[PDB]
Amino acid sequence: FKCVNSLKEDHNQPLFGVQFNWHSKEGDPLVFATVGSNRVTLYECHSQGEIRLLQSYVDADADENFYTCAWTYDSNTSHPLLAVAGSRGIIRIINPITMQCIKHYVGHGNAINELKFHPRDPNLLLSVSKDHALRLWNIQTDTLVAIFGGVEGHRDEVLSADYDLLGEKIMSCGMDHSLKLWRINSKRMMNAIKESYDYNFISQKIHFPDFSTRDIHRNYVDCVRWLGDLILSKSCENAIVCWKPGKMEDDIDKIKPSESNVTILGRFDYSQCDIWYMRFSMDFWQKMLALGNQVGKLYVWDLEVEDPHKAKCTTLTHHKCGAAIRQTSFSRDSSILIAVCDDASIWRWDRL
């Protein structure tokens, strides 16, 4: 990629999240949102590396510190929506056009570290919290569908989670060094979701994951993403590990909850990114893996290889980009890569 533009938000507070809106239809402008402090800002990408301000939101709660955001749409009107959350522990659903909070969800006993929308049903929002649990909400009926935690749930803050491509299961990870699998295509979860639509509510309490392991990393796991049936996760050892539950030949949907084996297929090494809450991202087609480090360098790996050790790694740098890159986001068409930093700076890279 080639560096084409950069800007710094006037509040000068660290930015933690960034997400292009992958719901926009072909031909419509590529838009992304940034979040940090009590701010949520929307931008539109144009020619000649232009980054146009589209709308902005400033929470009345000056002490809020948004950590992440996720896009969806109101299925009743096909209108885009943006969910945001952070240290306050409240989920806010914002209308990106009027920048008004239309709904909010409280329940988590503490900060929310990550939000993810189901890849098929736009109403299903997953939140992971410092309170050790994951929560699934139906934002159409404003109901808490299920709480994932308890007897075999996480024992420390949940830092990240991700639905697989088809939205049949979730993998979570956190400060207890573990990675846990939660299937949501079970008769129980399908039924809970179904009844949540009927409400005009008793949520499901899921205490037992379908798989759990603490043998991948030796410290906090601050980011996890599905790579097909494989898993990509990182800790603070300057490496993203690619692994899978069970043995080399085990099928992800055939492994039992008591499976004790794991198979590491390789890793993507980098440097100077050992501070906590530094997230990696992939493009929609999952052909590229990206991760920024604490000194402004942006690593990009080509995933279309037979093994991670043979994946070409491109290091993107700009002599003026020296702040920690908390998160990056590819446009749906992989043509643009945006990075946000701890100094409120935003960097635009257009595809090579």
Binding site: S24, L42, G228, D307
Partner: peptide, 29 residues
């Protein structure tokens, strides 16, 4: 070869997601 074979699932599943996306007409922000 496991990593390579996994790529097939990715291609098929991202295609499914892309097809559902093609059906939508979400209003632009």
């Amino acid at each position: 070869t496991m990593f390579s074979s996994n790529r097939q699932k990715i291609l098929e599943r991202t295609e499914t997601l892309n097809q559902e996306w093609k059906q939508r007409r979400i209003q632009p922000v």
